Amino acid sequence: GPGSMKEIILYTRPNCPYCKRARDLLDKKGVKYTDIDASTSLRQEMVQRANGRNTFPQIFIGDYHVGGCDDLYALENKGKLDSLLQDVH
């Protein structure tokens, strides 16, 4: 059958000295991450239709909302790498 690849979306402002880790890992693996401006005007609607209902900053991946930046790292190192990679893929 055909293939299947998910996409990663980060919801936050461009002034995130921590998010650099998340974006770094993604680009390092070789995936396409979408940077969503903190502006709720578009973030609220995006995150709302992305998960179903939400209006706060966090790290979205495929069909799941992580939350914190380091979170993705810890989980990925804990064994959730498969999911993260499968989502960012």
- Structure determination method: NMR
Instruction: Indicate the helix (H) or strand (E) that contains 29.
Output: helix 20-29
Helix pair angle (81-88, 20-29), 10° resolution: 80
What are the structural domains of the chain? 1-89 (3.40.30.10)
74 Cβ contact list (under 8 Å, min separation 6): none
CA distance 41 to 48: 11
CA distance 39 to 16: 14
Sign of CA pseudo-dihedral 32, 35, 40, 41: negative
- Provide the 3-class DSSP secondary structure of residue 36: strand
Alpha carbon 74 to its chain's center: 14
- Residue 65's DSSP bridge partners are 60
Edge-to-edge order in the sheet of strand 33-36: 33-36, 8-11, 58-61, 64-65
